[PDB]
Swiss-Prot record:
Regulatory subunit of the ATP-dependent BRF-1 and BRF-5 ISWI chromatin remodeling complexes, which form ordered nucleosome arrays on chromatin and facilitate access to DNA during DNA-templated processes such as DNA replication, transcription, and repair. Both complexes regulate the spacing of nucleosomes along the chromatin and have the ability to slide mononucleosomes to the center of a DNA template. The BRF-1 ISWI chromatin remodeling complex has a lower ATP hydrolysis rate than the BRF-5 ISWI chromatin remodeling complex. Expressed at varying levels in several tissues, whereas a smaller transcript was expressed specifically in testis. This is Bromodomain adjacent to zinc finger domain protein 2B. It comes from the Eukaryota. The lineage of its organism: Eukaryota, Metazoa, Chordata, Craniata, Vertebrata. Belongs to the WAL family. Component of the BRF-1 ISWI chromatin remodeling complex, at least composed of SMARCA1 and BAZ2B, which regulates the spacing of histone octamers on the DNA template to facilitate access to DNA. Within the BRF-1 ISWI chromatin remodeling complex interacts with SMARCA1; the interaction is direct. Component of the BRF-5 ISWI chromatin remodeling complex, at least composed of SMARCA5/SNF2H and BAZ2B, which regulates the spacing of histone octamers on the DNA template to facilitate access to DNA.
Amino acid sequence: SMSVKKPKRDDSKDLALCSMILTEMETHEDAWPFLLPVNLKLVPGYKKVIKKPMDFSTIREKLSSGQYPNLETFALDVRLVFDNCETFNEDDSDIGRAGHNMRKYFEKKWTDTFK
């Protein structure tokens, strides 16, 4: 409360560490469905159904331009990529399976880096 603060968790490395995690996600062999924004002209249904599209290239640009206020807003966008994927793709499809694999990979790196 006013003039009463918990001890300051060091966040000065968070930008660098999120950049490293994002590089590892970008270079995973199953990243291909997620590298670029879904083409809203060419993929019927996507525009209407997926209210907030997100992809790795868009996260990379937001990261590089100071558009994440803290490390939690960065994790929210990464999770959005996988939540969108599960909304639009069957579990038993190459893309559906890619999404599950990537979400697993991310969540381990997140825990190991920050928790």
